[PDB]
3C-like proteinase nsp5
Amino acid sequence: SGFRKMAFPSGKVEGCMVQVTCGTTTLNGLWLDDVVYCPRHVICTSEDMLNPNYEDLLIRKSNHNFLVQAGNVQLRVIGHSMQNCVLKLKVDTANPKTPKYKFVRIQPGQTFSVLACYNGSPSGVYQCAMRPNFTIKGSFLNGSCGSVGFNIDYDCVSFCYMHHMELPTGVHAGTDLEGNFYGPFVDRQTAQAAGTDTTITVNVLAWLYAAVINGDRWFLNRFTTTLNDFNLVAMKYNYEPLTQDHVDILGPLSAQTGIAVLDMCASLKELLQNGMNGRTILGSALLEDEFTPFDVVRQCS
Amino acid sequence: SGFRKMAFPSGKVEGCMVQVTCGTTTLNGLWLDDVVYCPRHVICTSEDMLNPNYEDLLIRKSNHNFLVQAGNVQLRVIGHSMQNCVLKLKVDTANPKTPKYKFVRIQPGQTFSVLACYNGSPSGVYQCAMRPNFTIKGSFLNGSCGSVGFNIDYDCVSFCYMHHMELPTGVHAGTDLEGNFYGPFVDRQTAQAAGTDTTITVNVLAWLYAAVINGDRWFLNRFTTTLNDFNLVAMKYNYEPLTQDHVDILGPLSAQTGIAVLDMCASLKELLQNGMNGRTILGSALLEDEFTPFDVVRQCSG
Ligand SMILES: CC(=O)Nc1ccc2c(c1)CCCC2=O
Ligand SMILES: [Cl-]
Ligand code: NA
Ligand code: NA
């Protein structure tokens, strides 16, 4: 029993974290096989924040301008190339700790673990979700750029996020490991602002199923709803629309608990209307939206 | 910016987790130097657990009754003994991944990271606090016994918890790595229950400081209070007493934010007496008490 925001064990990623330095700037890099991946803005000076021409900045660098430190060891950079907003530094040593891995671009609502790192040394691990507005609500200080987000399938690490920047509202933006940003963001210091964020409806429903699985039924009701009426109500509370895909994805949890998906939608509608009236669900006084249907099945039973 | 419930990186502990099997029971063990540590209840059948005599059950077992698996490699058990409620299995090989480590016993209110494991394979990591009632609000399924809790100080892993059982309310009970239970619990299938819990006051205050550092300031007010006055309020709301040591420990946070501890106690007083009036603090509608002052300083500055 119990339900916790649980991260993946981070060891397989810890063994890949390195420190990348270029000029006065030091951030984190991800060492897989013989390549070190890091945000391309490591090559920016104070002059290059607003309108950097990365192609022009990069053509002026040689391999030996990039210092890569793995633990106590200096790695030799023997090549470099830019792919979208990530720099790929080819080094002369394959990482002996490279796990089985892949690069996956995730969709809003998906969760992952973040290994926050500073100077190439891991600081902490926590669980995050890709918000509907393509930001993440992380915990990152200066020097955390290049910290990565990941899931672990079985023994295979799926890298899905690399941290690039903090937006003015205190939330965070970054890329997949092919260097494509999530959302409309760019690696420039020009004013950009996250879109209005919304609640991840399918995840709240998953988490309500988790509460039922762990023995809590107080918030259920005798009602059902059509999918369209549910969406008309939920959008008035800044909830994301629930699609037929989401309804299908909740099928397994619906079958485990005996509660039809649209019946659970009716309970959610009532919770939005009533609040919790001093009660908690799985120890929270708010509706939790950073557990996916897949997370719930993995953590519960 | 941002404030998350954050665990220590678990790599140094993952390298120590093994699978221990005795009869029909498989659970997790901790492999350090040439010893595997696991709950002594691994040797009990279900009937045994009703009223175990552990020394008697253990004399009947031989080294080869303990199947220890490190990944896909079997370890050879060459000795076995008990220390309080943990079984110590001496093996033929020292763990080459043994980190620098210590066994430490933590105090209620202090936090630690739990590496939840199944069949010797780490599955998840999360942060816990030792509750005042000596339970932890973990997330564990069958097979998680022998999962461990720890802190990391520099490069040294301080092991502080090994999981043994779930109580009927769904919270969890375990021992330190010397086999001493946290709390008035026993490793036996009998009637046991968590005592009434209280809220960790110094941790709530730490988290209020974290909120202020992160720009969440609506609950601050012009008032201050005294320890004795505030502790009457804490007692009334099932909060642990605030001591002078707690005030001293929060000192750094008080100087950095300009909010003295008793000034923040006046904020907490008002929150306890009036609620949050529909607002949240660091995204929470409840007052969070599983971050210590050290956790807050480390995450907001480090
Ligand atoms: C095989 C087996 O019966 N294991 C078992 C059962 C019950 C209990 C425990 C272990 C330990 C803690 C107390 C408890 O209730
Ligand atoms: Cl006053
Ligand atoms: Na590292
Ligand atoms: Na005040």
Q: What stands out?
A: Residues 261-274 of chain A form the longest helix (14 residues). DSSP finds eight helices and 13 strands in chain A.
